[PDB]
Amino acid sequence: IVGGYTCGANTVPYQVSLNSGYHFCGGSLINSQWVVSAAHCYKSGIQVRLGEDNINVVEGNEQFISASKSIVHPSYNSNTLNNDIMLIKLKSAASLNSRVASISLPTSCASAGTQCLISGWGNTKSSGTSYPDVLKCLKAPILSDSSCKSAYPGQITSNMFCAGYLEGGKDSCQGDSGGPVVCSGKLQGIVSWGSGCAQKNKPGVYTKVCNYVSWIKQTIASN
Numbered sequence: 006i007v008g009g010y011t012c013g014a015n016t017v018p019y020q021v022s023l024n025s026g027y028h029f030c031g032g033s034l035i036n037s038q039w040v041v042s043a044a045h046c047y048k049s050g051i052q053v054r055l056g057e058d059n060i061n062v063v064e065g066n067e068q069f070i071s072a073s074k075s076i077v078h079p080s081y082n083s084n085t086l087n088n089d090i091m092l093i094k095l096k097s098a099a100s101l102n103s104r105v106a107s108i109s110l111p112t113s114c115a116s117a118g119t120q121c122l123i124s125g126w127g128n129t130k131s132s133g134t135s136y137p138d139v140l141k142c143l144k145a146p147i148l149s150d151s152s153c154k155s156a157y158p159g160q161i162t163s164n165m166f167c168a169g170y171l172e173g174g175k176d177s178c179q180g181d182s183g184g185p186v187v188c189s190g191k192l193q194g195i196v197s198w199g200s201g202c203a204q205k206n207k208p209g210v211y212t213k214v215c216n217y218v219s220w221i222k223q224t225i226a227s228n
């Protein structure tokens with residue numbers, strides 16, 4: 006997260022870190038047994054880390070649970086990032102309390118102009134590299150469909166939305182990939198792609214979670 010703020014320990018209790026020997030992507034806990042992340046975050050050997058604030062220090066609220074199954078969306082295209090969503094099943098159910106909790110799936114899609122909360126352990130620099138230890142947050146508005154399409158002509162599908170700031174300075178970044186965009190208490194987006202981080206006229210692009218609720222529900226009912 007570039008241009009954001011320190012969230013506060015365990016204030017984003019649905020945020021997870023995906024770990025393969027090191028943090029590499031975010032995700033969102035949606036059920037005691039399931040995490041939603043980006044399909045571009047797929048890899049074998051994922052450990053899900055719940056209840057994290059500092060990802061480099063054991064602070065006392067963590068649950069580390071190995072993935073038992075990963076399910077990349079059937080129509081994921083890694084070239085365009087269309088359908089950039091994946092479900093991860095946990096080997097055992099997370100224990101739910103204040104510091105670890107699920108986030109609700111949306112009923113309706115989110116509105117242009119709504120201020121959402123984006124969070125993660127990704128790079129904090131637009132130019133150069135610095136990776137934080139504690140969870141960072143950014144309040145960012147959903148941009149209009151026409152603005153989003155102007156920023157990425159020919160590339161925005163109905164399964165994507167932009168959020169952020171055209172002036173630059175405030176954005177998600179590498180390492181935030183797969184993490185949540187929460188609007189009005191619902192998971193509306195997944196950190197997906199863009200062009201760099203916090204550059205002028207290149208806002209973040211997010212998987213539009215409302216289009217996937219039927220697939221998520223059916224998949225969790227059968228796996």
Ligand SMILES: NCc1ccccc1
Pocket residue numbers: 176177178179180181182196197198199200201202203208209210
């Ligand atoms: N600045 C949007 C973004 C986030 C994660 C990865 C690539 C691009």
Ligand SMILES: [Ca+2]
Pocket residue numbers: 057058059060061062063064067
């Ligand atoms: Ca920790």
